[PDB]
Amino acid sequence: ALQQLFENNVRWAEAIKQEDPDFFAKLARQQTPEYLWIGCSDARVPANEIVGMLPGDLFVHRNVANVVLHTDLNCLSVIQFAVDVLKVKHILVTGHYGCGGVRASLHNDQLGLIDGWLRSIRDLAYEYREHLEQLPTEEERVDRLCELNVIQQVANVSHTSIVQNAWHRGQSLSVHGCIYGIKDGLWKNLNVTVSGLDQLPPQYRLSPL
Numbered sequence: 001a002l003q004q005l006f007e008n009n010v011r012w013a014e015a016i017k018q019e020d021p022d023f024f025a026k027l028a029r030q031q032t033p034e035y036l037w038i039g040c041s042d043a044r045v046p047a048n049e050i051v052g053m054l055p056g057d058l059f060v061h062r063n064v065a066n067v068v069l070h071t072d073l074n075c076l077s078v079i080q081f082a083v084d085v086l087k088v089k090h091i092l093v094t095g096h097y098g099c100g101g102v103r104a105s106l107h108n109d110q111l112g113l114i115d116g117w118l119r120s121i122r123d124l125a126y127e128y129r130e131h132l133e134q135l136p137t138e139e140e141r142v143d144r145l146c147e148l149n150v151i152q153q154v155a156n157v158s159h160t161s162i163v164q165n166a167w168h169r170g171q172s173l174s175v176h177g178c179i180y181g182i183k184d185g186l187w188k189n190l191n192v193t194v195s196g197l198d199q200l201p202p203q204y205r206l207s208p209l
């Protein structure tokens with residue numbers, strides 16, 4: 001039944017209105033998050049809770065294994081809305097350890113549609129086959145690939161014309177790579193932050209319009 005969810009909602013809404021009766025009314029007027037979160041759909045990685053944000057703070061995209069593709073208008077439209085319309089200052093690319101999407105990309109079972117979605121991670125596993133091979137346990141290979149994935153996705157976001165054109169017009173915008181431990185609740189910085197055009201390889205730089 002959906003009863004408990006409806007009941008949780010009515011209790012939550014009422015609790016907030018008791019502490020601040022204008023809470024939702026004020027929020028509903030203007031959307032002004034400083035952050036966009038790009039993360040995995042995994043139920044164990046809820047964005048707001050992990051970084052203690054409130055409704056209104058965090059624009060969110062979640063997909064399988066937090067993949068960013070330059071032909072995917074789903075993720076790209078979230079980025080473009082965030083960057084062009086909301087003018088978020090930060091894009092938080094957050095992958096996590098023990099990601100099943102990353103895991104699936106390391107094995108050879110077919111999962112259907114998802115197989116094509118995860119292609120780019122599978123590409124990552126192949127380019128780093130040497131590195132990954134020198135790690136003993138599958139858990140280690142998976143977790144390293146989770147990190148490699150995040151670092152790659154940070155690159156992918158920063159290479160978009162969406163993000164470059166924000167920089168061209170002097171908009172302040174940083175793309176961060178973080179990784180969440182589902183084993184310990186800790187959200188960790190991979191320290192791969194990109195905040196300007198000068199940090200991009202020449203081959204990915206696009207001229208202003």
Ligand SMILES: [Zn+2]
Nearest residue numbers: 040042099100
């Ligand atoms: Zn995941």
